[PDB]
């Protein structure tokens, strides 16, 4: 097992409403967990618990290894698009090119005369929301880690682009890696090894897409 939550309850504020209530799941090494649910349901908070920024009041948690986290709020720091993606990690041409292809960024980059040395975050180019989201995803996927926490990374993307990048990046490029993906899209739940649907902190559903279809 790579990540376990067992009867986890947690609070951001002592004496408040629990942000997570009796949460249970298990991910084996290399599997994909999809975490779904409405705004405020506790999805980012669950990721924060895995990253150690929120401790459980009840229950047990297991996880080891390096984490790579992709925030639901895309961000850019001053520097080239290549510097933003490798972001202090050692550079390898093949690895970098595999990530930008999987994130459909080779298309965007090929159109600039400076190519991967185009400068971001310094008042020149103003990136679209979709461009910033794919750069942020690429940054998180480039990092070598044992666990990838991808919090709603497909912001500003149309449904076909989202589908293509989910398949090329999350399913193929990252096929060997333990992944938690916060997402609500049907294909992503169908392809995940397990699904956790949160509602107001509680487990609305936990199991597989097939199990949910069998309840209809």
Residue list 66-95, contact with ligand DUT (CB under 6 A)? 72
What minimum distance in Å lies between the beta carbon of 188 and ligand DUT?
15
The residue among 24 and 117 lying less far from ligand DUT, judged by its C-beta, is 24
30 is in an annotated binding site: no
Among 44, 68, 84, 136, binds Mg ion (CB under 5 A): 44
Residue list 18-57, contact with ligand DUT (CB under 6 A)? 19, 37, 39-45
What minimum distance in Å lies between the beta carbon of 38 and ligand DUT?
7
Count Cα neighbours of 48 within 13 Å in the Cβ-side half-sphere: 14
The residue among 49 and 141 lying less far from ligand DUT, judged by its C-beta, is 49
9 is in an annotated binding site: no
59 binds, among ligand DUT, Mg ion, none (CB under 5 to 8 A by kind): none
Query: 3-state secondary structure string, the chain?
Result: CCEEEEEEEECCCCCCCCCEEEEEEEECCCCEEEEEECCCCCHHHHHHHHCCCCCCCEEEEEECCCEEEECCCCCCCCEEHHHHHHCCCCCCHHHHHHHHHHCCHHHHHHCCCCHHHCEECCCCCCCCHHHHHHHHHHHHHHCCCCEEEEECCCCCCCHHHHHHHHHHHHHHHCCCCEEEEECCCHHHHHHCCEEEEEECCEEEEEECHHHHHHCC
What minimum distance in Å lies between the beta carbon of 154 and ligand DUT?
13
What minimum distance in Å lies between the beta carbon of 117 and Mg ion?
33
What minimum distance in Å lies between the beta carbon of 112 and Mg ion?
32
12 binds, among ligand DUT, Mg ion, none (CB under 5 to 8 A by kind): ligand DUT
Residues making up the binding site for ATP: 12, 37-44, 72
Residues that bind ligand DUT (CB under 6 A): 12, 19, 37, 39-45, 72
């Amino acid at each position: 097992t790579e990540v376990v939550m067992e009867n986890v309850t947690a609070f951001w504020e002592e004496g408040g409403t629990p942000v997570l209530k009796d949460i249970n799941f298990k991910i084996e090494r290399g599997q994909l967990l999809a975490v779904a649910g409405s705004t405020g349901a506790g999805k980012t908070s669950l990721l924060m618990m895995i990253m150690g920024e929120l401790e459980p009041s009840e229950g047990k948690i297991k996880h080891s290894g390096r984490i790579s986290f992709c925030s639901q709020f895309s961000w850019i720091m001053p520097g080239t698009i290549k510097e933003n993606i490798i972001f202090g990690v050692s550079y390898d041409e093949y690895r970098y090119r595999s990530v930008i292809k999987a994130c459909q960024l080779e298309e965007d980059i090929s159109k600039f005369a400076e190519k991967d040395n185009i400068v971001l975050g310094e008042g020149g180019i103003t990136l679209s929301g979709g461009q910033r989201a794919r750069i942020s995803l690429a940054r998180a996927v480039y990092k070598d880690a044992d666990l990838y926490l991808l919090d709603s990374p497909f912001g500003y993307l149309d449904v076909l682009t989202e589908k293509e990048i989910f398949e090329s990046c999350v399913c193929k490029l990252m096929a060997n890696k333990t992944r938690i993906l916060v997402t609500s899209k049907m294909e992503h739940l169908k392809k995940a090894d397990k699904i956790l649907i949160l509602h107001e902190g509680s487990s609305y559903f936990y199991g597989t897409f097939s199990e949910l279809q069998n309840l209809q």
